[PDB]
Design a protein around this ligand. Structure first.
Ligand SMILES: Cc1cc2nc3c(=O)[nH]c(=O)nc-3n(C[C@H](O)[C@H](O)[C@H](O)COP(=O)(O)OP(=O)(O)OC[C@H]3O[C@@H](n4cnc5c(N)ncnc54)[C@H](O)[C@@H]3O)c2cc1C
Ligand SMILES: Cc1cc2nc3c(=O)[nH]c(=O)nc-3n(C[C@H](O)[C@H](O)[C@H](O)COP(=O)(O)OP(=O)(O)OC[C@H]3O[C@@H](n4cnc5c(N)ncnc54)[C@H](O)[C@@H]3O)c2cc1C
Ligand SMILES: O=C(O)[C@@H]1CCCO1
Ligand SMILES: O=C(O)[C@@H]1CCCO1
Lengths: 386, 388
């Protein structure tokens, strides 16, 4: 327990109207930055609108096996992309399923680590894992017991990632498991067996009210532990399910925002916090929204080196945008592709979240193709609109 | 004894009966002769081979129109070929009274439009409507059945009266397993309501993935006999499987209200089809499926005697037309098919579209397996009843 942890717990269901003022202030940019970002966003969107899958989900899977996915990665790697591979799987319901997912992650780390061949955590590939894949009652058992049995499995995977010097990211799932996953991150960052490795990564969801306070805790943890934690800032993939759970629970105040523009303001405010902490954390700005991207690109300033920060996108969604970003002819910033690996069976749940993401009228990836939506609207600054 | 005590006790007893105890009577009822199985395999092979010689996640292909007027206009082409329609004004799980009132008015306006378009074609040849009870009562899943019944019954009765006045079909869609009992009690009250006399358009869905399915059918067939209504019965597998599994896990159940082996649902469907085909005097069976093997099995089970009004097939808009173009029509199988036609926009599409992705994306689904290079035609035409 700490002042930083208390701020997280107190924010869990803080009224939405009380959450917004500090985010609005932090997301407010100078006129020079706003004008530059609007110019960059317009250029990106005009390029996107010069560009343009089925329910088999083929668009979203990088390969059936890690061997297949690694072979298919060379073309984009020399263009300036990197990869984070995800062996598909989540919400294990039996011990056998959790054991199989563990074996999949373990085998992937060996293949990815060998393929990395000493490129390190920024220039080379990494892996993403879901804690719900590794424990058979992740959401239905007591958090203390879940973390206790989960810890040795995650530590063993992190030790392999350290052996090869690759990144290992913990994906963020449902809101009620944020606290458990954060306790696990803290144990790992204080574990001397992992010293000298900066590959531990952690996702924080800007649609969540606790997001800035989680970031304060992580930034402080990185600074005191000496681990340069990789922090993937996302909006969030489970919004519809969080709303349904909160409505059923009789909750007046939800753990997530209910207006999309509030999530957008939260993201920019949290990006400002991360960009002020690049000494101690490695921010990873995961977004397909060209306005969000352009804002961060200008907020980050003129100084850049590989390892300072990166962007990220999902395989099958982000390539049109990021082909306008990576490379010396564009913005010369790197992007890491989240690359699902698996069979069609393990793909299904991930596909549902992609459908909720692509099919929502509020999503950038839907609006970019909507004839009713103007470029002027797409480049709007969320602080100015809210 | 309480009215229908034996039939009602059989439904309740089946609710969470162990799967292994449910299956033996279904396997026997679903067993067909070698001669019929050979003929059905030949028909299924032809249908699948056609399904490839003649021929999106965002699901524009699943919605017939944004308004009922638009949907009705777009229906003329397939009606000309011999298809019929059941229109669904998209929307469900009303969270407020205002939402439930909005959906009620959507349905009411749709019945007037569909009824005008029907122009006296009647309940079999002409279009109908499908409704979801969760759209018409706020917190349908949460409120006690006493409060839900007392407010929902007058609304559904009013819609049924409008459908009677135009002589069109009005079908109650089946939703989550925990609302089966309420919906069935509502069906009974409507079927015994003299104000609806002379109209056979009331319809009801039964889900063959549910353990209660044959016992619900027994209750419905008996209800048809005592009410004098020829109840339209849509036999489906079911659309909420993934959600039912998750809910039963969170409910702490040792035995779930749905089957967990996919071929058990197939056996259940065929057994229930045999029961319906033996009761066509008092119910109108509507076999909703996109599975060519299921379709062929029922086509042969039904035998050589057919007339429009005996039974029909059904399919979802954007899924079933390629298969049923090999079914409807004299040179094909000469059997009718009704298309379930959603009407709405992105604001009301989400829940339905999720169920379509889970249906189309699942490795166990026929519509996925037909495009799977690892699945032989032999496997697609195999009778699942012989596996068990
Ligand atoms: C590489 C990568 C990794 C990711 N990892 C994770 C992860 O581990 N865990 C996770 O949960 N997400 C993760 N995400 C995010 C998620 O999968 C979506 O991709 C992301 O939220 C889309 O945001 P955007 O900026 O591209 O799009 P935008 O269109 O700008 O934003 C869409 C987002 O807004 C939010 N939203 C929509 N409607 C509302 C509303 N009414 N009220 C409040 N908020 C709303 C949702 O978060 C939605 O996804 C990841 C994304 C990427 C690109
Ligand atoms: C016109 C029409 C109307 C419909 N109306 C309704 C309705 O009101 N309510 C409703 O719930 N459904 C309804 N359905 C059914 C549902 O929407 C699907 O279309 C249907 O279940 C798919 O069955 P199939 O025979 O086409 O395909 P198949 O591929 O043969 O069967 C797939 C089905 O098997 C079941 N299943 C999958 N995995 C398992 C498993 N592991 N264990 C047990 N069972 C499993 C599911 O029911 C799944 O949909 C309707 C379908 C049609 C065509
Ligand atoms: O699984 C999901 O949908 C998100 C995107 C990638 C990681 O977590
Ligand atoms: O809504 C659904 O998904 C099913 C199919 C049509 C009616 O009920």
């Amino acid at each position: 327990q700490s002042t930083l942890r208390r701020a997280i717990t107190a924010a869990y269901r803080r009224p939405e109207t009380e959450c917004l003022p500090p985010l609005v202030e932090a997301a407010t940019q100078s006129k020079e930055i706003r004008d530059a970002a609007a110019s960059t966003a317009r250029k990106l969107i005009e390029a996107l609108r010069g560009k343009h899958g089925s329910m088999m989900g083929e668009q979203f899977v990088t390969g059936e096996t890690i061997r297949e996915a690694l072979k298919r990665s060379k073309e984009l790697e020399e263009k300036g992309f990197s990869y984070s591979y995800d062996m598909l799987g989540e919400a294990a319901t039996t011990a056998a399923d959790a054991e199989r997912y563990y074996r999949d992650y373990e085998s992937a780390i060996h293949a990815i680590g060998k393929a990395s061949a000493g490129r390190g955590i920024y220039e080379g590939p990494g892996i993403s894992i879901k804690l719900s894949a590794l424990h058979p009652r992740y959401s239905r058992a007591q958090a203390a017991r879940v973390m206790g049995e989960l810890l040795p499995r995650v530590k063993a995977l992190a030790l392999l990632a350290k052996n090869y010097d690759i990144g290992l990211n913990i994906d963020a799932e449902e809101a009620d498991r944020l606290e458990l996953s954060l306790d696990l991150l803290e144990v790992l960052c204080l574990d001397g067996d992992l010293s000298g490795w900066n590959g531990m990564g952690f996702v924080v969801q800007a649609y969540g009210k606790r997001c800035p306070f989680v970031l304060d805790f992580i930034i402080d943890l990185a600074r005191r532990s000496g681990r340069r934690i990789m922090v993937r800032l996302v909006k969030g993939a489970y919004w519809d399910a969080e709303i349904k759970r909160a409505q059923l629970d009789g909750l007046a105040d939800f753990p997530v925002f209910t207006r999309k523009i509030h999530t957008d303001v939260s993201y920019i405010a949290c990006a400002a916090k991360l960009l002020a902490a690049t000494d101690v954390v490695f921010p990873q700005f995961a977004t397909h929204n060209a306005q969000t991207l352009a804002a961060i690109y200008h907020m980050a300033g003129k100084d850049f080196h590989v390892g300072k920060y990166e962007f990220q996108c999902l395989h099958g969604m982000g390539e049109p945008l990021y082909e306008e970003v990576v490379g010396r002819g564009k913005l010369d910033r790197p992007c890491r592709i989240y690359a699902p690996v698996g069979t069609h069976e393990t793909l299904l749940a991930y596909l549902v979240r992609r459908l909720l993401e692509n099919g929502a009228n509020s999503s950038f990836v839907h609006r970019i193709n909507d004839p009713k939506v103007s470029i002027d609207e797409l480049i709007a600054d969320p602080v100015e609109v809210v």
